[PDB]
Amino acid sequence: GSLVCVGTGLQLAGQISVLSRSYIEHADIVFSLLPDGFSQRWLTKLNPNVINLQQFFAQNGEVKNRRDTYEQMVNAILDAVRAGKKTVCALYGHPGVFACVSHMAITRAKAEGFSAKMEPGISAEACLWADLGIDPGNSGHQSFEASQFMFFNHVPDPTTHLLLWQIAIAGEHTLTQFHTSSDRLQILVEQLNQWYPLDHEVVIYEAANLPIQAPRIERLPLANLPQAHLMPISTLLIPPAKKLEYNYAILAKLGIGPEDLG
Amino acid sequence: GSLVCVGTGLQLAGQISVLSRSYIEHADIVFSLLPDGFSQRWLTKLNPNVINLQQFFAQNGEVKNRRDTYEQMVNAILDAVRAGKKTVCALYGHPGVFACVSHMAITRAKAEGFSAKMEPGISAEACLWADLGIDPGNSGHQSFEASQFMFFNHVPDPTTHLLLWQIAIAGEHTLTQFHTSSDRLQILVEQLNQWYPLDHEVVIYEAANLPIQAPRIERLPLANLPQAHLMPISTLLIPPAKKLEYNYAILAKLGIGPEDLG
Amino acid sequence: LSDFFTQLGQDAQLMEDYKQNPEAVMRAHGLTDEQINAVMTGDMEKLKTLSGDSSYQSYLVISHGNGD
């Protein structure tokens, strides 16, 4: 048995890598986590032997910690590998970007003596740079999970493009609800106000999943975030609050100044 | 005329999107910037109408500001679009990630009334998460261009995975040399020592371009960076210097403590 | 509907035909007036209705911010 984890990207059918599609084609069995029924149908036509990982999230209002959902997904993947199957895990986006299940399954598979690897894919952030026409190198980039930004000590550089992922569950500490509350988002706004003014323009971004669909690019003042319509897939982009300033200390050690910059 | 900018990913032939390959296939003309002659041959077999953008870098020891190279690349692309050609720009990686030519060409094309868009691709950072088994969500992620970190005021969060891109030209202020010096990298080490101890293990990462090739994953103490062999494609990964610590301030506003986290 | 979206996502020729004339391309691939209306108003929920997925359930959060 063996494991390869691939990404399908965000867009239906066309955003998967040529090699990653060939892995899906030739797999004994595929474990899928895909955005919609169009994507599910496309996959099933590629390879009919598919187990849908969606079944492991809480059903019908059940209280279930997402840590247990993820453990159950990893165990299901590993059961196929342990049985001797040439196993592919086909996740949306990039299988290792804000996605624990593939990293955990590859760690466990290697520890049990099986061949396991991860093929990179096109993530929501890769779609954002393209859709917004932003280079993360322009003034640099920072990414945090929104709840981790609230629960632990993180300090953003306000010259950079800042991304808070999973903004829809920001401050949902139980890992048992699918969305947060407007009061939790108001506390996030107050926290961000240490670096960003309340009238600072921010962007709610959602990558499109269908070729006929435009991405969501909603611009609003930070103050208005707790009243905004958010979906599990939403990411909050916080553009720079300040322009780049000259690092005189280091320029002097280099024996140059601003006027010497090419 | 029209412009679509695509990425080819880092690996030969297999890391391009299904859709992005189809755009190259059906283009009137392709402007290429690819890692090697194997990639160039693969492209030429896909579409024989190729102009190689490599020609616009300084040749034979010429002194040329890279800003001029990039202008000349953008102008070449736009001349095909202005002539009426259905134009594709095929860059390695992601065409908009630490890559100015495609964003500039798309801005200019839109301003002159032509249809222009960018298709996301698999970048070197996407390859790194897969190769190192690191999720940027785990403790967060920050990316800066190494020289921009030295020349302007950037403050890293030392709980995150920190990436310094283009580390091989760190401090090369003229934009006319292809690599920096040992003394420039020693100044970067002293600068980073504000947040990272001198014995802090860092990683020199290079994504593989050929399917028979292993990525470069070189672990060394930060102090040893200025003696390291670096190539233009090298990225410096600086893993966390500190574990995540509880944000008691925000937990108190949420009315919870660490013991309440799911 | 599904066959059309799958072809359109993968085929740059059809994508560039579609972007020139969305309604003409959709009509030629058999999409109903209601389906085309759903596309032109960006109503992804009604498109899923019209493709009949017996509400296919799709939560795509695969990480958390609680550490450990």
Added chain:
Amino acid sequence: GLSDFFTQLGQDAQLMEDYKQNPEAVMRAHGLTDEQINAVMTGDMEKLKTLSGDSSYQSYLVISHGNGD
């Protein structure tokens, strides 16, 4: 023959999984010389480019700078 093999191997998951099982057997079966196989097993990318006749071709892959506006 080098370039044809690498292009197939990079795109085809079946050949990739055959290759990873037995690199030398797969490379011999696709006609690679003893020197080419040696270059692959030692990770000498420069010699492979020599042997394909390509590296001579100039590849600088920096498409951005850190000097601002």
